[PDB]
Amino acid sequence: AELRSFIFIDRLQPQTMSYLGTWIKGALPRANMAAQIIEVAPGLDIEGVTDVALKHAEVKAGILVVERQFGYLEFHGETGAVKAAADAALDYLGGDPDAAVRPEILASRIISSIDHQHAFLINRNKIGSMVLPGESLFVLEVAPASYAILATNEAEKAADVKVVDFRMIGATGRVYLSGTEADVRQAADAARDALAVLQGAKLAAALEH
């Protein structure tokens, strides 16, 4: 009924991958691997997607989740295999990647010089890297939620920031990044730019004529 995301991660970054590895129930990715993430509604449709994907290439599935509303599949491996499995999944889902719901940024803020108590509270909630008092913190909320992994991975590509937390499953996705102010602003720019590439996908046709 709804393709909420169809996300190719060309190369997973270390902190992003390490954070995934903290909670995902499936196969744990090797360094620098490509990955595909698919989110659908209704959630249970993802079971059929997973069946098709796994049986079309040698990919390792790290995520299979049917939450309250939506279903999620992630798989990774050699780039060739990931693309092949993704393409099979896509054909199963209508064959058009631009049918996917565009990401929306619901909230984004850079908090400069995080307060001591505030860092303590965040570090109690988060399962990734530690935020320090005085650091800057970037927070981003996106829907569909799965797009949080794209925002996070692209942020890490562009800046030496810490992945404090990111959630890519639910009604909305969340991204928490910390570091020096310049690094955090740079990382925030890259995360927003990554979503903008998707938001402006149909611009491609305008440029091809």
| Site for a second copy, rule CB under 8 A | 1, 14-15, 17-19, 21-28, 30-31, 42-45, 47-48, 50-51, 54-55, 57, 60-61, 63-66, 68-69, 106-109, 111, 114-125, 127-134, 137, 139-141, 162-163, 170-172, 174
The 153-182 site mask, x for binding Cl ion (CB under 5 A), equals --------------xxx-------------
The least CB distance from residue 103 to a second copy, in Å, is: 13
Q: Could you tell me the two tokens for 173? A: 């996705």
What residue spans of 29-170 are helical by DSSP H? 45-54, 79-92, 116-125, 148-158
For tokens 């004529």, the residue is 209
- Using CB distances below 5 to 8 A depending on partner kind, what does residue 120 bind out of a second copy, Cl ion, none? a second copy
- Using CB distances below 5 to 8 A depending on partner kind, what does residue 22 bind out of a second copy, Cl ion, none? a second copy
Of the candidates 146, 153, 191, the one whose C-alpha atom is nearest the C-alpha of residue 172 is 146
The least CB distance from residue 209 to a second copy, in Å, is: 38
11 versus 30: smaller Cβ distance to a second copy: 30
Instruction: Count CB neighbours of 142 within 10 A.
Output: 25
Instruction: Count CB neighbours of 156 within 10 A.
Output: 23
Q: Which residues neighbour 122 within 8 Å (Cβ) at sequence distance 6 or greater?
A: 114, 131, 137, 164, 165, 176
Contact assessment for residue 172 and residue 106, using Cβ atoms and an 8 Å cutoff: yes
- Using CB distances below 5 to 8 A depending on partner kind, what does residue 132 bind out of Cl ion, a second copy, none? a second copy
Site for Cl ion, rule CB under 5 A: 167-169
